[PDB]
Amino acid sequence: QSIDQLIKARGKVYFGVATDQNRLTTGKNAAIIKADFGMVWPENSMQWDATEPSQGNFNFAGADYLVNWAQQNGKLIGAGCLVWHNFLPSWVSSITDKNTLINVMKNHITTLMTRYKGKIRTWDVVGEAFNEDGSLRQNVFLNVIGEDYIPIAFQTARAADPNAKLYIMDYNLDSASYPKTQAIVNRVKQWRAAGVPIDGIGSQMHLSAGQGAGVLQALPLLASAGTPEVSILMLDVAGASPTDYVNVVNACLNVQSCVGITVMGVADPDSAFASSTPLLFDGNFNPKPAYNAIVQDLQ
Ligand SMILES: N#Cc1ccc2[nH]nnc2c1
């Protein structure tokens, strides 16, 4: 059974997975993604390191592979991350001039989104912008531009492709009492009140065991920021217990603006946290109990 088909039947948009050429050409990943998932994200090939390793010298082969594979197989596409501190070339983080960095950031945003204009459902424009206490994380953009880098990035993305849904995303948004969760809600509320085109909040749910239960309260709290959408991204759970995965699915069913869920990969040995076996398919590419529990919950 396909959890994408089943979650669509319940009124949601997709069940998705992060992947890339390295996985789509090995094992049973292509077959599983064709059968079970309705949306794909490039895990690495769209990041800044990969796409613009030298300023103005772009490298799109790997991202082109993913986009073309998705279109050929009828999958929705998410992509990112346009602006965050991860995968960031040192030629970007060493820039000290404000106007210089604004223009570099706008050009990176505009070039990537223009190349795939009309083909991308969701762009993660800004990622991991918050510290754990809810203050803004000090990356080169905050250091050099200031807090306006986030409005500027979304304004620029909206101008490049008005068809795409523009997300901010962060991790450790999984507990409704945690300071980082209420802070991103408070900030996104103000950005939207000021006309900034943030269409979504993406919760990067790299979860420890047992955290699924708290998502039932944290996800509606994120939705109270009033973005058109919220999404579950980078989902994995240490131990992969059905209890956690069913809790996460129930949370997205409970939140009307939650359009879908994206798991961080297909099979355990391809996880960056493989020793915690946190995904839905095992090392033989067979579905695990957590996969079956999601199927049964959605039926
Ligand atoms: N799942 C997922 C995922 C992985 C990498 C990303 N970069 N930007 N958005 C992303 C979403």
Specify the amino acid at residue 275.
S
Residue 273's alpha-carbon distances to 27, 165, 209, 240, 278, in angstroms, are 18, 29, 13, 11, 7
Structural domain including 100 reads: 1-299
| CB 219, CB 184: distance < 8 Å | no
- Cβ(248) – ligand 1 distance below 6 Å: no
Tokens for 136? 């803004």
For a mutational test of ligand 1's pocket, the pick from 33, 37, 41, 113, i.e. the residue with the most ligand atoms closer than 8 A to its C-beta, is 41
User: How far apart, in whole angstroms, are the C-alpha atoms of residue 272 and residue 6?
Assistant: 28
Q: Is 229 in the pocket of ligand 1 (CB under 6 A)?
A: no
Crossing angle for the helix pair 212-223 and 242-254, to the nearest 10 degrees: 20
Ligand 1 and 83: CB distance under 6 A: no
279-282 long-range contacts (CB < 8 A, ≥24 apart) are 279/236, 279/240, 280/240, 280/245, 281/32
Q: Name which of 206, 231, 220 is nearest 80 in CA terms.
A: 231
Q: Report d(CA 260, CA 4) in Å as an integer.
A: 9
Supply the CATH number for residue 245's domain. 3.20.20.80
* Residue 252: cis peptide before it, omega within 30 degrees of 0: no
Cα of 140 from ligand 1 centre, angstroms: 21
Rg (CA), the chain: 18
3-state secondary structure of 163: coil
* Residue located nearest, by CA, to atom 5 of ligand 1: 43
Resolution of the structure in the document, Å: 2.0
Does 152 contact ligand 1 (Cβ within 6 A)?
no
Verify whether ligand 1 is closer than 6 Å to residue 170 (CB atom).
no
Ligand 1 centroid from CA 77, angstroms: 11
Cα(194) to centroid(ligand 1), Å: 27
- Contact 298/288 with Cβ under 8 angstroms? no
> 4 C-alpha to center of ligand 1: Å?
18
CA of 235 to the centre of ligand 1 (A): 10
Type of residue found at 25: T
Q: Quote the number of domains for the chain.
A: 1
Q: Is the CB of 233 under 6 A from ligand 1?
A: yes
Does the beta carbon of 262 lie inside 6 Å of ligand 1? yes
- CB-based burial label for 106 (10 Å; 0-12, 13-18, 19+): middle
Q: Which residue owns the Cα nearest ligand 1 atom 2?
A: 234
